[PDB]
Structure formats: structure tokens, C-alpha cells
Design a protein around this ligand. Structure first.
Ligand code: HEM
Ligand code: ZN
Ligand code: ZN
Lengths: 90, 90
């Protein structure tokens, strides 16, 4: 499952240890320009809430997933997936 | 800090949810050909012990890491690096 508790633990590691991915997400899937920083406010089964510093200045964007997340691994799989595709284009 | 408890938790997750990689490591860093499948047995700070099925026979190899692992996060970062570098090998 994906509960707010499960969300925060994700956004703690993601922000602490995988920050360059959060930026690549805002850049490719968030349609931001010259992203200096991005952090995950929340992750739910339908999308994640990013706080991005990008062209025009700091903002909150919502990235919607193509499909709902059934479990937590779904979230692992999407964050590996989005990283790969976001690296493929640029 | 990697305790045989944390090795079992990483190895089980790797084994049930990311086997395509375990096989990539065994291929590229384990110098294995026609890798039917592979499994993570254990991960200690100096390397991982892997069960890689060659065609008609099972071998136990160890991938020593090119730099010691401090903690679990270092453990994630290398499983991530080695995946990236294994796919490049093409
Ligand atoms: C012990 C539990 C975990 C294991 C064994 C694990 C393993 C991996 C592996 C093997 C990859 C490479 C994927 C591939 O190339 O196919 C990966 C990527 C990733 N993982 Fe984990 N992971 C774990 C927990 C987490 C958690 C808790 C988060 C976030 C909250 C996370 C976030 C990511 C991200 C964002 C990627 C893509 C990173 C990139 O492109 O650099 N992982 N993980
Ligand atoms: Zn996973
Ligand atoms: Zn990590």
C-alpha cells in the first residue's frame, strides 16, 4: 500500500540521497527549465508533489503518473523508470 | 550499517523485485555468459555473493566491490551505479 507515512519515508531518502533524480523529474516530466533544485513534498498513488526552483522561480508542481500505484514497489519502479526515461531524452 | 539482517532485506527485495539487474551484474561484473537467471545470497561491505545459473549448471561467484561500503545507502548507490554501467556495456 501507499500511506502518508510510507510517502514521507520515501521523500526523506529521495531528498537526502537521490536529489538529482527529483530535478530530472521536474525537468522532463514537470516541464521546468534550468532546474537548480527540486524536493518531494508528498507521493500518493496517482502522483507526487515537487517543490522546484526553476525558470521564473520557486513553485509547487504536481507530476501525475500515467497509472495509479497499487503497492509501494510500484513507486520504486516508477522512480527508477522516470529516472531512466528522463536520462534517455537529454 | 550492513548486518546479515540488512543483507537479507536487500537480497530478498533484489531477488523478488529486480532480478533483471542481478543478472546484469552477473553478466558484466561476474564475467558470466548465457546467464539463465541470478539471485543475491548476501551483501557484505566488501562485495556481494550471487547464485548465477549458467546453462546446465549453477555456480556461486562473489563480486568484490571496488571500494568498501560504509552503510546501507552506499549499498543502494552501487546497485544503482552497476545497473547503469552494466546496460552501457552494450
Ligand atoms: C533495500 C531496499 C532497496 C533496494 C534493494 C533498492 C534497489 C535499487 C536498484 C537495484 C536500482 C537500480 C534500478 C535499475 O537500474 O533497474 C534502484 C534505483 C532507484 N531506487 Fe532503490 N532500492 C531500495 C529502496 C529505495 C527507496 C526506499 C527509494 C526511495 C524512497 C529508492 C529510490 C530509487 C530511485 C529513485 C532509483 C532510480 C535512481 C537513479 O536513476 O539514480 N530505492 N534501487
Ligand atoms: Zn524495488
Ligand atoms: Zn538510496
Amino acid at each position: 500500500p501507499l500511506t502518508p507515512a510510507i510517502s514521507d519515508r520515501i521523500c526523506k531518502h529521495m531528498n537526502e540521497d537521490h536529489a538529482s533524480a527529483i530535478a530530472l523529474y521536474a525537468q522532463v516530466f514537470g516541464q521546468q527549465t534550468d532546474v537548480t533544485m527540486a524536493q518531494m513534498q508528498a507521493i500518493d498513488p496517482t502522483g507526487m508533489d515537487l517543490v522546484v526552483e526553476s525558470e521564473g522561480g520557486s513553485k509547487t508542481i504536481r507530476i501525475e503518473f500515467e497509472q495509479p500505484l497499487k503497492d509501494s514497489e510500484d513507486a520504486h519502479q516508477v522512480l527508477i523508470a522516470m529516472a531512466k526515461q528522463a536520462r534517455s531524452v537529454g
